[PDB]
Amino acid sequence: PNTVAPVGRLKLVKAEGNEVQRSDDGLFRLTAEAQAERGAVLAADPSIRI
Amino acid sequence: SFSQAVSGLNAAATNLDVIGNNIANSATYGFKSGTASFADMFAGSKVGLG
Amino acid sequence: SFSQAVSGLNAAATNLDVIGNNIANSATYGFKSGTASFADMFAGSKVGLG
Amino acid sequence: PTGTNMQLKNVAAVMVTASYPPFARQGQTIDVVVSSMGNAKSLRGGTLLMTPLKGVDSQVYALAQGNILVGG
Amino acid sequence: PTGTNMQLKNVAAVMVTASYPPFARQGQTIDVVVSSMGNAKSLRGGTLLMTPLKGVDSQVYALAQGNILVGG
Amino acid sequence: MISSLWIAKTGLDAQQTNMDVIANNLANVSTNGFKRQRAVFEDLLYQTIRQPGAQSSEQTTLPSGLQIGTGVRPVATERLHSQGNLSQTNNSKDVAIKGQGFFQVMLPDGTSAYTRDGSFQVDQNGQLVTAGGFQVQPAITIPANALSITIGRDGVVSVTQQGQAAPVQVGQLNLTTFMNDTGLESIGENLYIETQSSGAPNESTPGLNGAGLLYQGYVETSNVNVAEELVNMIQVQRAYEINSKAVSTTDQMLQKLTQL
Amino acid sequence: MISSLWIAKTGLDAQQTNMDVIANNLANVSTNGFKRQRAVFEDLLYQTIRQPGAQSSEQTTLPSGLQIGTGVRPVATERLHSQGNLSQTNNSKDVAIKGQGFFQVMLPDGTSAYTRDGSFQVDQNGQLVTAGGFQVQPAITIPANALSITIGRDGVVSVTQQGQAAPVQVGQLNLTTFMNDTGLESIGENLYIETQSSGAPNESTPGLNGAGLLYQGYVETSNVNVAEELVNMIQVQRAYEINSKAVSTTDQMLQKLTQL
Amino acid sequence: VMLPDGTSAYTRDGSFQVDQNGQLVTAGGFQVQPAITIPANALSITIGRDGVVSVTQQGQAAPVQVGQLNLTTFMNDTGLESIGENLYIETQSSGAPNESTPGL
Amino acid sequence: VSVTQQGQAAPVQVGQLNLTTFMNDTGLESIGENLYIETQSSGAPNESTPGLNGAGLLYQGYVETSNVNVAEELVNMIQVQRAYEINSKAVSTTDQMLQKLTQL
Amino acid sequence: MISSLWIAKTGLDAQQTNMDVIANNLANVSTNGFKRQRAVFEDLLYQTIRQPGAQSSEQTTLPSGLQIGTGVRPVATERLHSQGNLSQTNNSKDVAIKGQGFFQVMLPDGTSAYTRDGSFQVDQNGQLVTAGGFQVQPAITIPANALSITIGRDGVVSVTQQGQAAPVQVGQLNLTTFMNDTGLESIGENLYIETQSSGAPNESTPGLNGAGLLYQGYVETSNVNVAEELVNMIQVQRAYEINSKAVSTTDQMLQKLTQL
Structure with missing residues (x-):
């Protein structure tokens, strides 16, 4: 068990209801207005806790 | 600690046997008295066996 | 009371041994008789030690 | 102190290999290859500290120190 | 005091490496590379305190102190 | 399974050792050139539930903290070398x-x-x-x-x-x-x-x-003294009985703890 | 989950500690240069609820208001340094x-x-x-x-x-x-x-x-007084009985609430 | 308690553990603020009534003072925001976190 | 040795x-x-x-020997059992509320 | 059925094994050259759940995570080869x-x-x-x-x-x-x-x-010492009783689950 080492970090984002829209396959994506202001890809929020 | 005391009881009985045999031969030409000698049975020190 | 009594028992035994030694040396030229002196072993003044 | 616990994370022990070129003269520079030796995750932007490059005869023929370039 | 617990967070122990240029004269300035040595997260806006740069012969040839520039 | 049981299980064993020494001494009361034995005991572990002297406040120390102890162990039986x-x-x-x-x-x-x-x-x-x-x-x-x-x-x-x-x-x-x-x-x-x-x-x-x-x-002859061994048997018997009573009290406490 | 059960558990632990001290004292009877130990307990905190001395009414105050106590906890075990x-x-x-x-x-x-x-x-x-x-x-x-x-x-x-x-x-x-x-x-x-x-x-x-x-x-020799230890063993056994009964009573009450 | 993001939370769960690098942390591993570092050669660890953490070292008839476990008091404790992992963070209705030595 | x-x-x-x-x-x-x-x-x-x-x-x-305190474990079993009996009752209450809701 | 039932069952089996060894020792008091037996116990498996030492944050570690243990099993029986x-x-x-x-x-x-x-x-x-x-x-x-x-x-x-x-x-x-x-x-x-x-x-x-x-x-003669066997019988009886109480508690828990 001494071998345990970090490998990668999950990307955790913060988005409200008014910014995301459910695509046809059930996966949420950024709406047009919200995407235009927050960019194409959402930056990971360091405050999110899983 | 029962065998240790039983051994002492047996030794005392042997001593008294010798004393009685010596007394019974108080007047017996050519009789030489008997004497019992005892030695302890220590095993490895710190404990006695009798 | 089992350590204050044991002390008195031992003192009486010592006195009796001294008396027996005096008796056994009744006929011994140049022998001087012996006597035992006892003293209390008080501690606080309310607690006797024998 | 001899009795102490050091638990580093920014230091890696490495082996440096190089080629001594023909007719090499003192003061010239050569390229070196830096390879990690024990349980190190990466050598991305590390700096090689002063390293004496020995020959087969265990004599120092070069001194190595620089910045490592890892592909990425 | 010798017996005390210091638990710092704004200080990092680093190794400084530089090149002594040809015909260098005292009073001139050279660039240095600052590399962390143990379990330090970053050196973003740190300042290098007075550091004597030794040679192979363990003699001080330069004195280093300045502000570190980390890419970001 | 409980602390007092182990402590009173060490007390029993120490008193049994004392009785063994007494009985061995009495059994060899007549053997020539014998040296009688004496068992010595010492305290076992002391759980520092509250270390003595701990700094409770910044100026007041705690005197004689909660030092719950373990039972007893015998160091050894030493031979009383005296002239018989x-x-x-x-x-x-x-x-x-x-x-x-x-x-x-x-x-x-x-x-x-x-x-x-x-x-x-x-x-x-x-x-x-x-x-x-x-x-x-x-x-x-x-x-x-x-x-x-x-x-x-x-x-x-x-x-x-x-x-x-x-x-x-x-x-x-x-x-x-x-x-x-x-x-x-x-x-x-x-x-x-x-x-x-x-x-x-x-x-x-x-x-x-x-x-x-x-x-x-x-x-x-031996240096064993019979009267002192008799008195020591009396005290050891009483100590063993009292430690057995401690065992019994612990047993009752555990029983009526389980029965609720 | 219920306060009375924690209080009775603390009482049980304190009585077990007292019995452990008693057993340790009785196990070291034959030890030379031994000093008997005695444990001292204190109560633990006190729920405030209604602050006593508060104004019960504009001209009157509350005498000795509602304080709810927690269990008990041992302070320390003091030795008795007296000439054995x-x-x-x-x-x-x-x-x-x-x-x-x-x-x-x-x-x-x-x-x-x-x-x-x-x-x-x-x-x-x-x-x-x-x-x-x-x-x-x-x-x-x-x-x-x-x-x-x-x-x-x-x-x-x-x-x-x-x-x-x-x-x-x-x-x-x-x-x-x-x-x-x-x-x-x-x-x-x-x-x-x-x-x-x-x-x-x-x-x-x-x-x-x-x-x-x-x-x-x-x-x-040790200064352990054994008759005092027997009487204290009786006392400890009875106290453990009563605390276990308190635990059992609390158990019976929670059962009726479950049944509700 | 110091959260990984860098902001401070507050907890009343007093079950702590020393991590590999000494340091007292909560059950989840978050370091308890401000730090108390217990050495390896300690024979007994005592946290006093006032919060002075002293340890016993072999041969040293005196304890070594390690740290003070000061607490934080709010004005309206009921206004704190419970974030989950047994931690409270300061909210608009529970401001002014006042650090203090316990007992004071 | x-x-x-x-x-x-x-x-x-x-x-x-x-x-x-x-x-x-x-x-x-x-x-x-x-x-x-x-x-x-x-x-x-x-x-x-x-x-x-x-x-x-x-x-x-x-x-x-083992350092398991016995009375602590028994009191803890009492607490655990009654706690599992109060959570089961909460489950039953939620089930009854759902049954009444979906029945209409 | 439920983990606690298996764990307490293993505990009961271990205590029964201890009692078996005790009875074998007691039945051979009069046997010449007999050596007493002792049982050695070990922990069973440990469910890992959370890995102790895992990375909880980028600079913090998980100290002593959630290890859930299984019951107990006897390792081996060792004799005391000493002079009787x-x-x-x-x-x-x-x-x-x-x-x-x-x-x-x-x-x-x-x-x-x-x-x-x-x-x-x-x-x-x-x-x-x-x-x-x-x-x-x-x-x-x-x-x-x-x-x-x-x-x-x-x-x-x-x-x-x-x-x-x-x-x-x-x-x-x-x-x-x-x-x-x-x-x-x-x-x-x-x-x-x-x-x-x-x-x-x-x-x-x-x-x-x-x-x-x-x-x-x-x-x-045999080296079996009776007093140790008696104290161990008390230990075995009380530990068996506690484990039976744990089994009963698991049974009541499961029954409450069945009623709903």
Whole structure:
């Protein structure tokens, strides 16, 4: 068990209801207005806790 | 600690046997008295066996 | 009371041994008789030690 | 102190290999290859500290120190 | 005091490496590379305190102190 | 399974050891050259539930914290080396020591043991031996044509032959003394062997730098005192019964804890 | 999950601690230089609810308002440093203390520990050590050919050699006294070490400003009073009974709420 | 308690553990603020009534002072925001976190 | 460890019992059969002689027993059982509320 | 069904095993040369759930995560191979061991077993057999009209014939020693067979290489100490009772689940 080492970090984002829209396959994506202001890809929020 | 005391009881009985045999031969030409000698049975020190 | 009594028992035994030694040396030229002196072993003044 | 616990994370022990070129003269520079030796995750932007490059005869023929370039 | 617990967070122990240029004269300035040595997260806006740069012969040839520039 | 049970399970064992020592001493009340034993005890672990002296506030210390202790353990049984009373057997072959020395005897395996028992016999070959048949140092031989054996206060063994007005010296008996006599390892049969806690065997002659004197026709009896052993049996019996009562009280507490 | 159950659990734990202390005291009856221990308990916190002394009404105040207490918790176990009754073992090396002093020994680690037990032996090198082999300060060296060792009331150790009418002094036994004697940390093995609550070790001669007198041939037995221990065992058993009954009663109440 | 993001939370769960690099942390591993670092050679660890953390070292008849476990007091404790992992963070209705030595 | 052979009056040293001291004891991983392996929370196993560097002493002829307090476990069983009986009742109440809701 | 039920079942089985060992020790009080048994227990598997030492944050670690243990199982049974107390039976055919040796006898299958019991008889052929009739390798045959049998401390068996002033030698009683005496496999009838964990059989005479000495007329009694067995019976009963209470608690929990 001494071998345990970090490998990668999950990307955790913060988005409200008014910014995301459910695509046809059930996966949420950024709406047009919200995407235009927050960019194409959402930056990971360091405050999110899983 | 029962065998240790039983051994002492047996030794005392042997001593008294010798004393009685010596007394019974108080007047017996050519009789030489008997004497019992005892030695302890220590095993490895710190404990006695009798 | 089992350590204050044991002390008195031992003192009486010592006195009796001294008396027996005096008796056994009744006929011994140049022998001087012996006597035992006892003293209390008080501690606080309310607690006797024998 | 001899009795102490050091638990580093920014230091890696490495082996440096190089080629001594023909007719090499003192003061010239050569390229070196830096390879990690024990349980190190990466050598991305590390700096090689002063390293004496020995020959087969265990004599120092070069001194190595620089910045490592890892592909990425 | 010798017996005390210091638990710092704004200080990092680093190794400084530089090149002594040809015909260098005292009073001139050279660039240095600052590399962390143990379990330090970053050196973003740190300042290098007075550091004597030794040679192979363990003699001080330069004195280093300045502000570190980390890419970001 | 509970702390008081282990503590009272150590108390029982220590008192049983004390009874064993007492019974062994009483059983050997008549063996010559015997040294009686004394068991010593010491405290076991002490759980520092509240370390004594801990700094509760920044200026007030806690005196004598919660130091819950474990039971007892015995260090060892030490031999009370004292001079037993001498008796008069009047057998030219019985010798008794007056000081603090030991006789040296050669074990069959080639090593040497040390005994204070003076009941010596003569084997078929004429050597002085211990009653257990072990040949005693220094291998004092006794001729077949012996009329009387005289062992003096200096350990000189002399034998007077027939019709000769002068005695013949057949050896010299020496005594071994140790720095610590207690540390000797008893191997039974009234024999002790050397241990590193007993230093080294210093051989000496009987009357010089600290070996004892030898008296012929005398036997050294044991130093066991019967009355003190009786009183000690009474106290040990009471202590054992009280510790068993502690065991029973713990058992009742556990029972009526489980029954709720 | 319910307050009364936690309170009764704390009571049960305190009574078990008291029984553990009693069992430890009874297990060390035969230990020489042992001091019996007594535990002292305190209550734990107090729920405020209604602050007493508050204004019950514009002109009147609440006398002794509603305080709800938690269980109990042991503060500390204090030793009873009193002269244990003496006993005559008739040994030249056993030493007992009549007053309030301690013997000093050196642990193998180099530190100094303190013991009141005086059952001493001699090692192979001739130094006076305890039963556990620890060398007693101040390091009295007994020479090879000793005939008798005399330890006086003031701590002088003398050896009488052969043929010399005068005794040779070979050391000086001192006693260490503490301001707070109960604050020492007991490590077991009849050994106490200095803590910051036990002041500092003051060396003194045995007979001076408050060190005790040394008796040769005597041992200080434990001060455990056994009848008191039996009565306290009865008390502890009954208290554990009552606390277990409180637990069972709380168990019966929660059952009816479950049934609801 | 110091959260991984760098902001401070507050907890009343007093069950702590020393991590590999000494340091007292909560059951989840978050370091308890401000730090108390217990060495390896300690024989007994005592947290006092006032919060002074002293340890016993072998041969040293005196304890070594390590740290003070000061607490944080709010004005309206009921206004704190419970974030889950037994932690409270300061909210608009529970401002002004006042650090203090316990007992004061 | 000293071994006494027949004839020799001096014991012969055979070996040394070295104690491994950790700085965070509770961080060890219990691997089953009365054995613990080191983890990242209990790093740097320090070999030492018993009695030095904070290590413990050795008593021969004695074995350390379990430190399980029995009354604590029984009271804890009482608490656990009644707690599992109050959570089950909460489940039943939620089930009844759902049944009443979806019945209309 | 539920984890706690299996764990408490394993606990009950372990306590039953402990009671079995206790009863086996108690039933063999009068058996000559019997060695008491002890059980060793270990933890069962440990469900890992959270990995202790896992990375909880970028700079923090998970200290001592969620390890859930299974029950308990006995590791092994170890004997206490120590010298039992000797008993004088005043029989020329009974021999006792003073050290750490074994008698070698031959099973009817031709393989050799090892026994520490010294109660020997003489068959119609005169060969020294044990109480069960196994021939004590090697030989010791006995002449027809023996008057007395003398077995020395070093295993020399001699017979005194009529009209002959010198005893004749009829055998040599030897002892077998093992590297590991606890590894011998008990088969009953006071017999131990060789295994691969008991090393190799080292044949030797009594007095050399460590092998013990032989005493004629004595028997080696069992080493079972009763008081320890009684305290352990109390321990086993109370632990079994606690584990049964845990089983009952699990049963009530499951029943409450069933009712809903």
